[PDB]
Symmetry: D2
Subunit: 345 residues, 4 copies
Amino acid sequence: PIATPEVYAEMLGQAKQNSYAFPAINCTSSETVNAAIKGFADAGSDGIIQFSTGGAEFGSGLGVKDMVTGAVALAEFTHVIAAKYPVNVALHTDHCPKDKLDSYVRPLLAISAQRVSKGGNPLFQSHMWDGSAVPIDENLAIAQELLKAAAAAKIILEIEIGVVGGEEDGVANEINEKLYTSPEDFEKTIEALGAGEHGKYLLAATFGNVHGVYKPGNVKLRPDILAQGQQVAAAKLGLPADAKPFDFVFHGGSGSLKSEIEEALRYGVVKMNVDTDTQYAFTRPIAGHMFTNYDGVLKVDGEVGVKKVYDPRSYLKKAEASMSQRVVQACNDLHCAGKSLTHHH
Amino acid sequence: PIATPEVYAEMLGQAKQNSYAFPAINCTSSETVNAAIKGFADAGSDGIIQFSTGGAEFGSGLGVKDMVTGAVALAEFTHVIAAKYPVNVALHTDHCPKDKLDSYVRPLLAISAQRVSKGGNPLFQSHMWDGSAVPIDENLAIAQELLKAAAAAKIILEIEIGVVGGEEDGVANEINEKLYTSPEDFEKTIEALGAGEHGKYLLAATFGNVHGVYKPGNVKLRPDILAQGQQVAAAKLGLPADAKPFDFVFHGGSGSLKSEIEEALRYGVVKMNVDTDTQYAFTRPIAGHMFTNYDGVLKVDGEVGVKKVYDPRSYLKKAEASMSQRVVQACNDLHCAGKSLTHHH
Amino acid sequence: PIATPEVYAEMLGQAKQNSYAFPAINCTSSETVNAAIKGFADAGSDGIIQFSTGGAEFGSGLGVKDMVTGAVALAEFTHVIAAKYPVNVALHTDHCPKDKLDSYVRPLLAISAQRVSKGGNPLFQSHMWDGSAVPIDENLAIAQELLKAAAAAKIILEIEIGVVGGEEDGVANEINEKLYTSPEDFEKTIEALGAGEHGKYLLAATFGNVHGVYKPGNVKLRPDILAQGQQVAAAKLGLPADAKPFDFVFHGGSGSLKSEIEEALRYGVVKMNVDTDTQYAFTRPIAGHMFTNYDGVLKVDGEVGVKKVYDPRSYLKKAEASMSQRVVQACNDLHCAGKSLTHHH
Amino acid sequence: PIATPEVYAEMLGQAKQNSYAFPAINCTSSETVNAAIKGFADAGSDGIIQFSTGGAEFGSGLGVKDMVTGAVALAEFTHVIAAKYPVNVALHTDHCPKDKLDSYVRPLLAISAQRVSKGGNPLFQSHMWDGSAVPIDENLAIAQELLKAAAAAKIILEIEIGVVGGEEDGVANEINEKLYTSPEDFEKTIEALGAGEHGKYLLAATFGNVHGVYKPGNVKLRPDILAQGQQVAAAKLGLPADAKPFDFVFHGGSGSLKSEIEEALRYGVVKMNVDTDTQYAFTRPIAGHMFTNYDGVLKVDGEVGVKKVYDPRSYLKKAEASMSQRVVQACNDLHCAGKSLTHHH
Ligand code: NA
Ligand code: NA
Ligand code: NA
Ligand code: NA
Ligand SMILES: [Zn+2]
Ligand SMILES: [Zn+2]
Ligand SMILES: [Zn+2]
Ligand SMILES: [Zn+2]
């Protein structure tokens, strides 16, 4: 089923308590949603499906190119599908910067507020505010009012401090020192938003994260930044030094070393975003299909091709199954496999 | 917008009166739905999006494989998208034989009946009963009760007399004399169902039709069968000899000669089904993408590929645009281009 | 065996007498030579293997790029191979313009003169002088002295009047009226060189010929130009009006209509050049090989490929066999199949 | 130039004295010969071109399939080409087992004996007798008489003790303990043939060698076997313990670790055979060419392709250049680069 807000909060609490995390898989289509949910199910795991601004625009089609339309359409599709799987599936929106709030997160929030006002549940269970490109104080000012709106709609807010390196859509962030979150940013976050009691939130605190897949080991993660952020917050809050007040989000998950994932889990990461690796998994058998069936997918030497192999289902089923396998791998990497809160086992 | 039942009836009436038809494009996904609707819009045309049994199964994902789930999920997706286009889009289900009625058309009918009972409109605007594999009397007995249910849910029923040749999913129909509908079958149809006054229906009367794309000219259509069927019916009904009591459906549209389409339009074809040609149009740029970007979509010689080209959106946008072009061609072949009943022009 | 000058003259005499012609296949390598000779043998036919200036440069390798070296190396290779086939194989050099005479045809002539002086036979059995880019009088002045040298070395000279359209190497000739040979050019040729008694020669008189392969029918051949050239010459020589004093060469053979070849044969064509079509035949199975074995010819996803399919012999044997089939087709198109003067049958 | 027997002996003496070796590159064609020689030249190095039984059969063409014909044809081609390069190129034949002696090495020896009898030099400068599949005593009995014939024709004999693992043509040798040469085999070799004074020879003593390319490190070489073989022989001959009486040949060179090559050079390897790696280098840009030019090398959607890219020279020039680069790498790996005995520098 789709995660209710209550089940989603239980999911994250269980993950936190037991030092595991859920994959948050970027999807762009019916096929990619289907692949993600089947991956969760095959792994006996709960999970999160997320739409980026570009993914939502793509989902709306070339004749529309509207983020709200694409996200709503894909969300409605997902609600129907997820009802037929035993595992819990949460819907999320990825990086939304300041100039897209009015055309993505805010109208989506308003849609969910309306549903809640009628006694229903929100369409999405979490939304990301990415204010990493503006100064920390402005980031958190926007975060505070968005958190009030989100909590009122039974929605968890994800926020970001520090910058994720690499290319996300047309835009590149330089890989530098800004990829490492400062102690003061950790402190200001707690001051501004508390530790859950003013609305539940997730913190994408960056520790060297880079979107994309580079040669293994080229991206230099420093998970210790997270351990120190937890210590900083526990001190502010008057908690024991081993308390973990933050629920962390691991961006740029694809291409990470297994040891880096394992370490991050020890410091309170409850969500790891995966996009690039599942994109490769989806595309890889499509490529193979076109090459091995080149004379069926192309009308060559006066022949008319072979429908059996140019039927989009023929290669897209292969794409789906391959992406699902990669999602199973993510569930085993993050230790959420076999832990679905439905215990359908 | 999605066609209301009243707008759909107006569409078909206009097409009939003016000797044009709408394309009915088989879709299987968010991308193919988006491509079809954009094609209609680019052509300034209304149109029909249809899901086959296999298309619906595919739409539900490999972990579900349920026709009702896939059709409902894709339908809900389509309702969101179609609201953002000026043209009218009707939703339809394709070939449903006797052994799949209880797991496809009937439960879908029941869903729409429920919506109508609450003062709403049906989820789908038409459904196909394909009883061509059973004797004509059984075919029409089932048709009569389905027509009552359909009319009660504000849904048009499509039925089939005669067999369409070729392969549709795993199953092949032999290309023979059964592809040509008999006069008695035309007569029994009118006796059983009337001419609209017991429920609105479309008639897929076969005249040599074959699913798929063979070398141009290999498939031998006999559109005169349709002209004679109209004459047969007008005689039964006591109408002038030039009356056209049937609304005909042209199956196996892909690969047809332009002259064959033109002739069929003169005898009351109001709907032509297209699947194979739009499948080729969708796949063709995907094939080209994989070949020209072979070293980006594959991790070769120890390199890690190129995300920009293995991102599924990169080739699927090309697929969408190419399929939309083929749909524009169908609208111009069927003379519905520039005739949308929204007159947004 | 390699055609001796006496056997080559007999070949051409037989072809002329019986209204058939030999294919002259452009080759560039051991594999293409092997493919051509096997094609001749499979067709029970004699034939001609020819090297263009660019083909000879290619044959010499990227470290040498010397036309004489490449032609000699490929010729020596061919002498060894041809000895093992029952059919007669003549060696020829293709288009040599004025600025390449001193670095191609002349030094090759000198090599053969040396062999003949020692009591041997020439290395090549014919050479082409292409003076179509200079005025007719200069063309024939050069032709006359080259003919003396060639005859002294037991070599037949091919000359060209009129221009062949299209691209031959880096250089394009415009497709225009210059592609059609003038009566005066026919007359000047006979005046300058006679009709065999001052040295045996072949005449590439152009009649709309274009190098390359365009859509069937786009190239407009006028074989009547040849019939009139024969009439013009028979008049000058005081022969009956149905005499055929010229041995014609049909350039741009690839992509020609079968009816065009048949007509040209009636007017004394004894040699038709084929390059573009045999290039496509050679390459086509190589393309197929790479696509169907994509994961064997490329080291993908950390694997090391599959030697069985990246071994150049695996696809080059397929290339050879396919090119040989196209050469068999040329022998059947030109009616030389089953007519080898060895009568090994 | 082609290496005279005197220059070839000088080459090997220089390599031995200075602890370097020459690559022996398997070739199958004009293009592969050209690529190999250009590689030697680019590296300022002498080198060896070798034809296997299968390579020679391939070189003779599908209509002939005769090892002697193919080897002679390719050798004659090579003599013309090599004259135009400043470096010395030696011609060799690879693995010839007992059942192919009468149809490969023996007739080739007879051809060279004839040339020498007329005051000329041999066609090939070395030939390989591979008797590893028969007992050591039979191997060396055949070796002794072949050595007499070879020396009389100014030809060096290569022999093999121990088995090379892997697939060489249709035949596979199991990767086991037989891949490691025994001390007694080293001793019997010296007893039978001496140390050069009864005819010059090269010794392919196996030390774990495997034909082909497996994942780096999977093939376990033991170069110490060679050091001990040298010690064994120096003892038999009454030489100092650091003497190197054997000239060793390193089979299965492709895919070897650089450290393994470096070690082998210290123990008297003067020749390393490379085939599989140069095959991959030749094929790799051909694959890339077909993919990136897929719509030019195939006639698609009713188009006629693009001659510029289906011309075999277009991709074979790329193949040549890539194989030459790999040969340059071999010259730098074996430390013969910059050491050509022509000192053209
Ligand atoms: Na990443
Ligand atoms: Na069709
Ligand atoms: Na041509
Ligand atoms: Na090897
Ligand atoms: Zn991210
Ligand atoms: Zn149909
Ligand atoms: Zn030509
Ligand atoms: Zn070997």
